Amino acid sequence: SYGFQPTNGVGYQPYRVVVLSFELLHAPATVCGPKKSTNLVKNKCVNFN
Amino acid sequence: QCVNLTTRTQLPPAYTNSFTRGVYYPDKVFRSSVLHS
Ligand SMILES: *[C@@H]1O[C@H](CO)[C@@H](O)[C@H](O)[C@H]1NC(C)=O
């Protein structure tokens, strides 16, 4: 164990770190951004996302 | 309720051939009419 002090250490302050590990190009995604959807117009040269 | 099973008559090992059941789909992809390796 290390001596976690309020301010005596000055440096070496605690750091709460969280690491995210995404996995891409896989089975249908469960997590996505807040972007919304639109129609599915067919028989037309359209961009798709 | 667990207990050692008595009358555990030891038996010789048994062997067989794997034949033609040893694979799976490596990825979530619908590659069709392809000879992918
Ligand atoms: C059964 O035998 C095994 C192996 O010696 C032992 O670990 C286990 O505790 C025994 N169970 C009982 C209920 O005596």
Nearest alpha-carbon partner for A22 in A11, A8, A32 = A32
Q: Which residues of A12-38 are buried (b: 16+ CB within 10 A; e: fewer)?
A: eeeeeeeeeeeeeeeeeeeeeeeeeee
Contacts of residue A27, Cβ cutoff 8 Å, sequence gap at least 6: B28
Indicate which atom in ligand 1 lies nearest the CA of residue B4. Answer: 1
DSSP string, B1-37: -----S------------TT------SS----S----
Q: Is the CB of B5 under 6 A from ligand 1?
A: no
Q: Are the beta carbons of A28 and B30 closer than 8 angstroms? A: no
Separation of CA B6 and ligand 1 centre (Å): 10
Q: Is the CB of B9 under 6 A from ligand 1?
A: no
Using alpha carbons only, what angle is made at residue A38 by residues A23 and B29, rounded to the nearest 5 degrees? Answer: 35
In angstroms, this model's resolution equals 3.6
